[PDB]
């Protein structure tokens, strides 16, 4: 469901980000991940998924 997909999506995006050099991680990508995590913690798992879509678009 959206809760599982949000948790798995945060893990998947972070796994890709952890392949980049830390000094190569765009601020917009960090911000989008933080928004997804905030929404996950609020129980807005649907909103988390939409923020994860933004994070993927920020991947270099």
Smallest distance, Å, CB 35 to a copy of itself?
9
Three state DSSP letters for the chain: CHHHHHHHHHHHHHHHHCCCCHHHCCHHHHHHHHHHHHHHHCCCHHHHHHHHHHHHHHCC
Smallest distance, Å, CB 22 to Eu ion?
28
Report 9-48 residues binding a copy of itself (CB under 8 A).
38, 42, 44, 47
Comparing CB distances to a copy of itself, the nearer of 14 and 43 is 43
Report 15-54 residues binding Eu ion (CB under 5 A).
42, 44
């Amino acid at each position: 469901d959206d809760k599982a997909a949000c948790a798995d999506g945060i893990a998947a995006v972070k796994a890709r980000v952890e392949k980049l050099a830390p000094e190569a991680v765009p601020q917009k990508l960090k911000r989008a991940l933080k928004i997804a995590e905030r929404e996950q913690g609020e129980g807005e798992f649907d909103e988390c998924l939409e923020a994860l879509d933004d994070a993927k678009r920020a991947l270099p």
